[PDB]
């Protein structure tokens, strides 16, 4: 099996599968859409007592499949449980991560896209102060990039340099992948990392020069740092702050299990996991959480900040903050420097979700790296179409695939791995050979703690707000559904087939 070369390498390219969109783009407007610091409680409680202790389980569920020639989870999941349902909940091992490259790779192209019209200076020209006469020029070059309706139908027109661009990343993407993990991802996180941490402070750094009579980048932070004990009572905000810990950590997307599958047996896993989860949340907390928030409450105030966030998820990173920034000398190039960061943050993650396809498919249905990673490509590239014309198809896919289900796959794996496989032989599989020991408390976190915890939020999500979802969307949805259902369906015969063909090669093997 390959193997990492380094640990500063390990270490890297697992911070940058953590690293990405979700921290510059999600995090914000999960925080401002939750009331600021009112958000935070939970969501540091929900690092402590799911995020740390997932990574951990995460790491040694793929340092141990790897020891054994296996980096996915249908495999992994049997090798911890000998029955054929083993299999099959593993299926969303290789599901998840797919179904949430579908659109996460297109909305990592419009980063791509935006940043080659902002360092060629192809942007919109707002007027010389009225705030809608600032932003709405934005708000349209956003919406001819990716084509939103004008009418009622729910179809969307990409525009032709958007399409093509999407073209250039799935090729970048492949670039990468098609070299390995230790002369592909790894050699790339070396030179990624080290550019998105600059460029992130610097950002930083400019955005907290920002003022404006409507207030200053200080602002901003008192706003998302401020405790807010009275909303700590509502499940709402649970959720949001369990969910995006998932999301931001690459949990539940079997992604850390695949990267994880080629650390050395004898290998740390506890100090190197830990790493990775406290470099990813100061990229997030501290420099995602000091960006666009800050900047946006400078220049319009928290209250109307706010609004922003909740009328529309992309409008703070791909609307506000240039509109803001074209109010500056320089920028149009401090826009170039936001979507160059944007884009390798995203880069390094999408790369994150595509190996555990790959993976597979070298492991259990031994392609080759090149054909296993064409393969994949092609599978994305083909599905993101759906992604591409059909308006909220992202949104249905980014619900199913990158929200319950990773919780859901989140709380199974915890099961399978503490409570089936033995969470005396699971706690022993994480601390050996690490530099450090588990804190012992966590043991009893991840025995009981962590999946009653989950267990209630699932409980609530499927109870108060999955009918909403399942009642009140647009027709449409169900295209949505019936495609990513067909995936599951066909990633099962894939896994059906690794079965046979195992069957086939040990009655050679005899
Ligand atoms: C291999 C699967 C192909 C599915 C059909 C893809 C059709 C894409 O079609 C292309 O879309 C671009 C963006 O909207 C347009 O700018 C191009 O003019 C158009 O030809
Ligand atoms: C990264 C380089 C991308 C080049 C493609 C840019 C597409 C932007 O725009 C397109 O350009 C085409 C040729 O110039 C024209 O024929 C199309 O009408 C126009 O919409
Ligand atoms: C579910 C995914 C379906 C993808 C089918 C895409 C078919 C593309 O259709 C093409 O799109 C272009 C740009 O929007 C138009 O200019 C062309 O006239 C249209 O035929
Ligand atoms: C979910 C997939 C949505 C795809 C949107 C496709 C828009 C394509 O464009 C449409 O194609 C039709 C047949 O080719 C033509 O009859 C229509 O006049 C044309 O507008
Ligand atoms: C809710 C999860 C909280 C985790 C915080 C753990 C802080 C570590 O706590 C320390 O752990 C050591 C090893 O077990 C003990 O020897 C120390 O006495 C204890 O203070
Ligand atoms: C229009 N809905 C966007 C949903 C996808 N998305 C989310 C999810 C919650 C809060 C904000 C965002 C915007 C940024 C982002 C980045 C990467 C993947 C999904 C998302
Ligand atoms: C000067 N060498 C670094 C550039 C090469 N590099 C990048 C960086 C950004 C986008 C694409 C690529 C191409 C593929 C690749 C693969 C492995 C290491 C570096 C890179
Ligand atoms: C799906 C994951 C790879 C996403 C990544 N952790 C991010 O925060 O963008
Ligand atoms: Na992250
Ligand atoms: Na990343």
Redesign the pocket.
Same mark, same amino acid.
């Given at each position: 099996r390959e193997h990492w070369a380094t640990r500063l390498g390990l270490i890297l390219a697992m911070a940058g599968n953590a690293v990405?969109?979700?921290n510059?783009?999600?995090?914000?407007?999960?925080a401002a859409?939750n009331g600021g610091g009112a958000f935070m409680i939970p969501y540091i409680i929900a690092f402590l007592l799911v995020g740390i202790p997932l990574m951990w389980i995460e790491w040694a569920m793929g340092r141990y499949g790897g020891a054994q020639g296996h980096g996915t989870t249908p495999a992994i999941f049997y090798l911890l449980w000998r029955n054929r349902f083993a299999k099959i909940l593993g299926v969303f091992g290789l599901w998840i991560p797919l179904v949430?490259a579908i =659109? =996460?790779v297109y909305?990592?192209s419009w980063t791509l896209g935006f940043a080659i019209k902002f360092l060629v200076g192809l942007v919109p020209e707002p007027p010389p102060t009225d705030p809608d006469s600032i932003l709405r020029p934005f708000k349209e070059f956003l919406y001819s990039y990716i084509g939103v309706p004008k009418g009622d139908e729910p179809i969307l027109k990409p525009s032709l340099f958007a399409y093509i661009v999407f073209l250039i990343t799935m090729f970048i993407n492949v670039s990468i992948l098609i070299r390995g993990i230790s002369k592909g991802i790894e050699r790339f996180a070396k030179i990624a990392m080290p550019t998105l941490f600059i460029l992130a402070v610097f950002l930083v750094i400019r955005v907290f020069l920002l003022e404006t009579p409507n207030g200053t980048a200080a602002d901003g932070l008192n706003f998302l740092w401020t405790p807010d004990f009275e909303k700590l009572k509502d499940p709402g905000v649970w959720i949001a702050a369990v969910?995006?810990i998932f999301?931001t950590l690459s949990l539940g997307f079997g992604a850390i299990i695949t990267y994880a599958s080629y650390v050395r047996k004898d290998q740390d896993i506890v100090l190197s996991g830990l790493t990775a989860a406290t470099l990813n949340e100061k990229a997030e907390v501290i420099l995602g959480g000091s960006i666009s928030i800050p900047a946006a409450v400078a220049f319009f105030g928290v209250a109307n900040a706010v609004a922003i &966030?909740k009328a529309? &998820?992309?409008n703070?990173?791909f609307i506000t903050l240039p509109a803001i920034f074209s109010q500056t000398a320089g920028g149009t190039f401090l826009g170039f420097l936001w979507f160059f960061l944007l884009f390798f943050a995203?880069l390094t993650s999408s790369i994150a979700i595509m190996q555990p396809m790959i993976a597979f498919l070298e492991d259990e249905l031994k392609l080759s790296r090149k054909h296993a990673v064409l393969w994949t490509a092609a599978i994305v590239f083909f599905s993101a179409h759906l992604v591409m014309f059909l308006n909220?198809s992202?949104?249905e896919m980014?619900?199913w695939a990158?929200?319950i289900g990773v919780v859901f796959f989140g709380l199974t794996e915890l099961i399978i791995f503490f409570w089936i496989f033995g969470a005396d032989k699971a706690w022993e599989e994480i601390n050996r050979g690490g530099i450090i020991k588990v804190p012992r408390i966590y043991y009893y976190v991840m025995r009981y703690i962590t999946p009653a915890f989950l267990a209630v939020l699932l409980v609530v999500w499927a109870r108060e707000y999955i009918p909403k979802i399942m009642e009140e969307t647009h027709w449409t949805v169900w295209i949505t559904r019936f495609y990513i259902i067909g995936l599951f369906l066909f990633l099962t015969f894939l896994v059906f087939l690794a079965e046979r063909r195992r069957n086939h090669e040990s009655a050679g093997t005899l």
């Open positions: 990405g969109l979700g510059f783009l999600r995090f914000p407007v999960q859409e949430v =659109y =996460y909305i990592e969910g995006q999301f &966030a529309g &998820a992309f703070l990173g995203g909220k992202l949104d980014d619900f990158g929200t």
